[PDB]
Amino acid sequence: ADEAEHGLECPNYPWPHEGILSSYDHASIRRGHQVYQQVCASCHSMSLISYRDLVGVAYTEEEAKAMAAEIEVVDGPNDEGEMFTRPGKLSDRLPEPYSNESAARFANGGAYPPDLSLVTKARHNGQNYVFALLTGYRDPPAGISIREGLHYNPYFPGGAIAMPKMLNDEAVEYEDGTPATEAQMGKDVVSFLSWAAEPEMEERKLMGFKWIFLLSLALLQAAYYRRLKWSVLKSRKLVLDVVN
C-alpha cells in the first residue's frame, strides 16, 4: 500500500571487500560458491559465469576441471547429425536448472527465479539487500495475510515473495569446518554473488589507487608549471596615465 509497496530498507553491513584498498575474502567466495551449487543452483541460473572464472579465485585448475567434468553438457551435432552429451570443460558456462523461462515459471508457481550473475548490481544497495532478504524471513505484521504459495519477507517489495526460506541452519556442509549457520551462509553466498557481478573489482581498485596518486602528483606539477609561466604577468608593474 504505502510502505509495504517499497519494502523495508536494508541495513549497511561491513563487507570485507568494502574500502578503497579492500579485496574480496576468497575463502568466503569458495564457501559461497558451495552454498550456491548446493542450494541456489536447483532454481537460479548463473549464465555469465564459466568454470574457468573460478580458477585462481576460489579453485585450482584441476579442481574446476573435475567440477566441470561432473556435469553433462549437450553438444553436436555429430557426423551422423545428432545432438549428444559430453563431460563439461573449463570453458562451459554454469548449467541452467530449467530449459527456458516458461519452465522456470511452471516449476515455481508462475514466478521466474532471476539469473543471479549480476543480481548484486541489479538491485539498489545490492549486497546488503540480498543478505537482508535471505536472512529476513519472518512472521508478517498483525493484520497482514499472505496467500498460499507465497511467503512473507518485509525486504521484498510488497512483502510477499515466491521464494521459500532456503538458508535454513546447516543446509550446507563446509569443507573447512566453518559452522554453517544461516547468517554464515548468507554472508558467504553474498560474497560469492558480489564477486560474480564484479570480478574485475580488485584490479580496478589497484589501478585506481595507483593512478589517482600519480595524477595528484601531476596536478601539483601542473599548478607549479602554470604559475611559473604566469608569474611574469602576475608580478608585472603597470604604469598608466589615467586616474579616475
Binding site: 509497496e5 578503497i20 555469465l48 572464472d53 532471476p114 550473475s117 549480476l118 548490481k121 541489479a122 538491485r123 539498489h124 545490492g126 517489495p157 557481478a197 570480478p199 574485475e200 584490479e203 580496478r204 581498485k205 589501478m207 585506481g208 589507487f209 593512478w211 589517482i212 595524477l215 595528484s216 601531476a218 596536478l219 601542473a222 599548478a223 608549471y225 602554470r226 609561466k229 604566469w230 604577468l233
Partner: protein, 387 residues
Amino acid sequence: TIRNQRFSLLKQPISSTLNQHLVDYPTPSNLSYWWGFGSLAGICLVIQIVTGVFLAMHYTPHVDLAFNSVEHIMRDVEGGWLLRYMHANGASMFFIVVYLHIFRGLYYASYSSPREFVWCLGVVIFLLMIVTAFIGYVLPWGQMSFWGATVITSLASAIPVVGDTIVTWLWGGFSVDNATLNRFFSLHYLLPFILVGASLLHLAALHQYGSNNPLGVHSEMDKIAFYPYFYVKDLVGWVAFAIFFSIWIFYAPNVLGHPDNYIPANPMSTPPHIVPEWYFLPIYAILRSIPDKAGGVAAIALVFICLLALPFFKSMYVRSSSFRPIYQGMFWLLLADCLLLGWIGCQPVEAPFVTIGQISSLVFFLFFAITPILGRVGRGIPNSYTD
C-alpha cells in the same frame, strides 16, 4: 617586410592556420578557470569517440545479443571493464562539463552581442548531445533502455494527425524491437561526428570576435597569446578533471546509474521506478509538470525556444553579473531551481512533488521572461545614477 626567406615554421603555410587559431590567438589575460570548460568538453567528446569506436568492435546491436555483448566486454576482453566504465561515466562527465560551461555563459552574459551565433550553435550542440546520449543509453538493452526508448519514441504521438505514423516510423514497427535498436546503433555512430563538426563551427563563430571575459568589458587592450598561458591553465584543468573522472571510474563506477539496466529488457513488465539518466532529469521534471501530453511536449520545445531567443532580447549594455546585482541574484535562483528540477525528476509522480515541479518549471520560465524586462529597465541606470 618581404618574405623572401623562411622564418618560424609556425608561420609557414603548412602550419599558419593552426598557429593563428591555436598558438597565437589573442585571448583576454583575465580569463578565470571558468573559461577552461570548453576545452574540457572538447576532451570529453574525443574520449567518448575513442572509447566508443573500440567498444563498437565488441558490441552486437541485436536484441538477442546486445546485453550479452556488454557483459562480454566487461568480463572477457582485456581492459573491457575500463573501456565501458570510461564511455558510460564519460557521458556523465561530458554533461557535467557542458552544464558548467552553459552556466558560465549565463553568468557572464556571454550570449549577448556580438556572440549570439556562438550561443545558438551551442544550443544546437546541446540538442545533438541529448539525442546522442539517449540513443546510446538504449544500446545495452536493459530495462531502462527499453522503457526509455518506448516513451521517447512515443513523444511524437503528441502531434494530433500524424503523430502515430511518426512513432511507428521511428520504431520500424508496432513496438520497440530489434529494428529500433539497430537504427539507434547507426545513429549513435553518426551523431558524434556531426557533434565534432558543430563544435568546430562553434569555435569559429567564437573566434570571429574573441572570448568574453569576467569583467564583460572590451578586452583589446590586454590580450595575450593562447599558447602557452591558457594552454597551461587548461592543463591544470585537464589534470583535475582526470582525477575526478578516475575517482568515478575506479571507485564508484555505478553510482551515476540505476541497477535496473543490469536486468535484461522485459517488454512485459515496466519497472516500478522508470527514470532517465541524471543529466536528463530536469527536462523530465518539466515534462511531467504539465498534466497534458501535448502541453508537456510543447514545454520541452519551449525550453529550447527560450534558450535560442535569449541572445536576441533587447537588453542593457552591461554583460557581467559582477556589475548587475539583480541579474546576479536571479542567476543563483535559476541555478537552485535547475538543481531542484533535477531532484524532482528522480521522485515518483505524487504529492508534494507535482506542486513543487509545477512551481519550479514556472520559475525556470520566469528567468527567461524577466531578463528582457531587466534589460529594458536597466537601460535607464546611467541616466538615474549620476556622479
